[PDB]
């Protein structure tokens, strides 16, 4: 039973890392389509020149 709990904890942590990294990568993706107003560029290379 202890190993089953620990196994759930380990699966949660692995998923947290996957979610965390996906979130982190969302900050680097250039919104191709002009339209979406919402994603304000965070990187000077994003451009705005």
């Amino acid at each position: 039973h202890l190993l089953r709990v620990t196994n759930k904890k380990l699966n949660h942590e692995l998923q947290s890392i996957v979610n965390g990294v996906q979130t982190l990568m969302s900050f680097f993706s250039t919104p191709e389509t002009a339209c979406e107003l919402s994603s304000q560029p965070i990187f000077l290379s994003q451009l705005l020149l």
């Binding site: 965390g20 900050f27 304000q40 965070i42």
Partner: protein, 103 residues
Amino acid sequence: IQYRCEQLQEIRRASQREVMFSAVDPDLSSSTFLEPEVLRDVREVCKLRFKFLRSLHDDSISSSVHPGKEDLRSLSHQQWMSMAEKVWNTHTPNHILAALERL
């Protein structure tokens, strides 16, 4: 990873539609309207660099290579570099560029 995401989210929030750049009608001297911090910092960074370049220019033109001026140039150059770096740490790239547009 969470710590890094939090940092980038803070930068995104700061970027959101911020920095009212009042068209300084040049004639209207008086209204103490307070320059946005980003504009002041960018301008100052740019002015500092201009004065530095100007100094190089004046020297190039006046042929007086006073021996010891190089230590002072390096310092000035470093000072600007630090300031420029500070500007990029303190403000969002979006606001800096906006400030440059206005300038």
